[PDB]
Design a protein around this ligand. Structure first.
Ligand SMILES: Cc1cc2nc3c(=O)[nH]c(=O)nc-3n(C[C@H](O)[C@H](O)[C@H](O)COP(=O)(O)O)c2cc1C
Ligand SMILES: Cc1cc2nc3c(=O)[nH]c(=O)nc-3n(C[C@H](O)[C@H](O)[C@H](O)COP(=O)(O)O)c2cc1C
Ligand SMILES: CC(C)(C)c1ccc(CCc2c(C(=O)O)[nH]c(=O)[nH]c2=O)cc1
Ligand SMILES: CC(C)(C)c1ccc(CCc2c(C(=O)O)[nH]c(=O)[nH]c2=O)cc1
Lengths: 313, 313
């Protein structure tokens, strides 16, 4: 028995990959992710030009999870484009490239350049919809009119299947609206739920201080704190987007957590905080643990249980 | 060395109270909370008419917290008004009464009738701004024009100092807008942050089932999942509303969690999931734990550290 699957016209040895931003910023990182047992990898969300990111400390983790306000540090789009075009070994696993330009125009200009490499090599685009609206306005995914516009422009500019990275929502009306917006775009073939839970605040009791330096300690939450939120978003989008795939992201530390993501509707399962903390070894463990739960339940394929979470009455 | 506080023209032996909805639905519950060592109590959020609420199971708890979709079960306004005017012993501790009408008009009629009792007995109003909107719209506090509408009419109909129970926000632009709206209303003297983290989904791996019956298993999250979110919201409002009190609510299981809330700016500190799980004995433990932390740091009163969370640079 094996966890192999096919989607977006690619083949994957297993449904696991890193979450964008974790172990994927540098050529060394991407080489490390490629040499891992993961079924795929995704590059750090990039901008046109290189960015240093925010002052450190900017990431911290704890037994229940992590907090970060990295500030989109990245080597720049030319670098990830070149990794996709000349360096990545597509015989090893598929690659996704994440983009998070600081305006619609910057994103349009990056996707136009990405298109021919996508055609030629099969790199897949994950558009990060936590990219900024503007200061003064919520991130783009929490402003449905700007979201519709980004997607209009990117679909026109890119013209090939892509996916989107979504922030979590917390209100059923917002699931209905967000998903209807996404379903206006036939080229949006996968929806990744979720990005970090925005602007939480970790305080250290001993020092009476926040733990990261940017934004007066406020930053996005990952890890155990966000698993039920992540499952709710995957399932809400899975229900509402029957002609798309959903990729689950959030609070994956075990094969069990991955199993619940898939029950919720996930096709692929991304690993952030737990990967940052444990390292790329985690993928062999996660595969073994998911195959073990499967064997005990008698499931031979992921298809047999994906999206089959039971409701009560 | 003192946990005492004086606010809103009342005296409180300590900053702890139940979170609305926990251990506060029936006369028996409210007498139990009064007999406890809590510094105050709040009644279950009520509607004009009694309600049975949603079908069961509708609440479940786990090591890292709870999920609920209770559906506002409650004995009706007349019962909580009678408890406030005739049954509560104000010599023991102060009472808050929470209301959560299903329309602006329902809220207006309850506050008109609460007003004379508030004036005469000193019962304090907590207006629940997660009260449900017209369905297919977001909850009232995620719809800034509905929120403004509710607070104008309640200010007018009530005419006395009150507070508001807020859902969590996840986006800085949302903090800024919400606090600006609250700051339009001088009678809003306290802001309770936060209500449950909306529409999470808990899935049981063994049974492959959601754990609550309503809303296909979607419900609000409390407990350890939500502490950083709750701390972020406390501090965001503490900083943006210098003329109002902030009450903290979310993820309190220990004197240490309470300490972090208070550092973030909390005055009162409410306890939901951990109280539902542990019972009212929690309050003695919480007081002893918080006093132990204070003794170790040389703090003699709450005001010596309230809101004094340090940032880095
Ligand atoms: C250090 C760090 C960097 C991140 N960078 C990105 C990014 O560049 N783009 C992105 O879409 N999400 C990014 N995230 C969010 C993750 O991809 C993921 O959605 C989130 O951490 C929740 O998953 P987890 O619970 O497994 O951590 C980052 C997370 C962390 C912790
Ligand atoms: C069973 C249950 C019932 C609740 N009912 C109410 C309510 O009637 N009104 C309200 O404002 N909040 C209600 N809440 C929210 C709690 O007041 C609190 O805001 C939330 O549970 C987070 O605090 P915690 O993490 O200590 O649980 C309820 C929570 C639970 C778990
Ligand atoms: C330019 C600035 C407004 C500082 C900014 C733009 C875009 C992002 C998104 C990158 C990202 C980050 C990050 O790099 O801080 N962290 C996450 O948890 N998720 C993310 O999606 C983060 C920060
Ligand atoms: C279950 C649904 C019909 C969506 C609903 C009705 C009413 C309320 C407000 C009461 C409330 C409840 C509740 O009674 O379900 N639970 C919370 O965690 N916080 C609350 O504020 C919250 C939720």
């Amino acid at each position: 028995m094996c966890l192999k699957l096919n989607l977006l016209d690619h083949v994957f040895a297993n449904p696991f990959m890193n979450a964008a931003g974790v172990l994927c910023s540098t050529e060394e990182d991407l080489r490390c992710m490629t040499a891992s047992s993961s079924g795929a990898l995704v590059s750090k969300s990039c901008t046109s030009a290189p960015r240093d990111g925010n002052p450190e400390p900017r990431y911290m983790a704890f037994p229940l999870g992590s907090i970060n306000s990295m500030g989109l540090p990245n080597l720049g789009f030319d670098f990830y484009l070149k990794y996709a075009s000349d360096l990545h070994d597509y015989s090893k696993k598929p690659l996704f490239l994440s983009i998070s330009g600081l305006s619609v125009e910057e994103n349009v200009a990056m996707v136009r350049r990405l298109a021919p490499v996508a055609q030629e090599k099969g790199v897949l685009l994950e558009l990060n919809l936590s990219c900024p609206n503007v200061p003064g306005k919520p991130q783009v995914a929490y402003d449905f009119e700007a979201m519709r516009t980004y997607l209009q422009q990117v679909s026109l500019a890119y013209g090939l299947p892509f996916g989107v990275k979504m922030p979590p929502y917390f209100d059923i009306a917002h699931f209905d609206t967000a998903a209807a917006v996404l379903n206006e775009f036939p080229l949006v073939k996968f929806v990744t739920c979720v990005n970090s839970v925005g602007n939480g605040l970790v305080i250290d009791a001993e020092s009476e201080s926040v733990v990261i330096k940017p934004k007066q300690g406020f930053g996005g939450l990952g890890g155990k704190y966000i698993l039920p939120t992540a499952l709710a978003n995957v399932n809400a989008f899975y229900r509402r987007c029957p002609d798309k795939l959903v990729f689950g992201c959030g609070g994956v530390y075990s094969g069990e957590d991955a199993f619940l993501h898939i029950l919720a509707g996930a096709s692929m399962v991304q690993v952030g905080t737990a990967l940052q903390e444990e390292g790329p070894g985690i993928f062999t463990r996660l595969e073994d643990e998911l195959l073990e739960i499967m064997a005990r339940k008698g499931y031979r394929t992921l298809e047999e249980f994906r999206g089959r979470v039971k409701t009560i009455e």
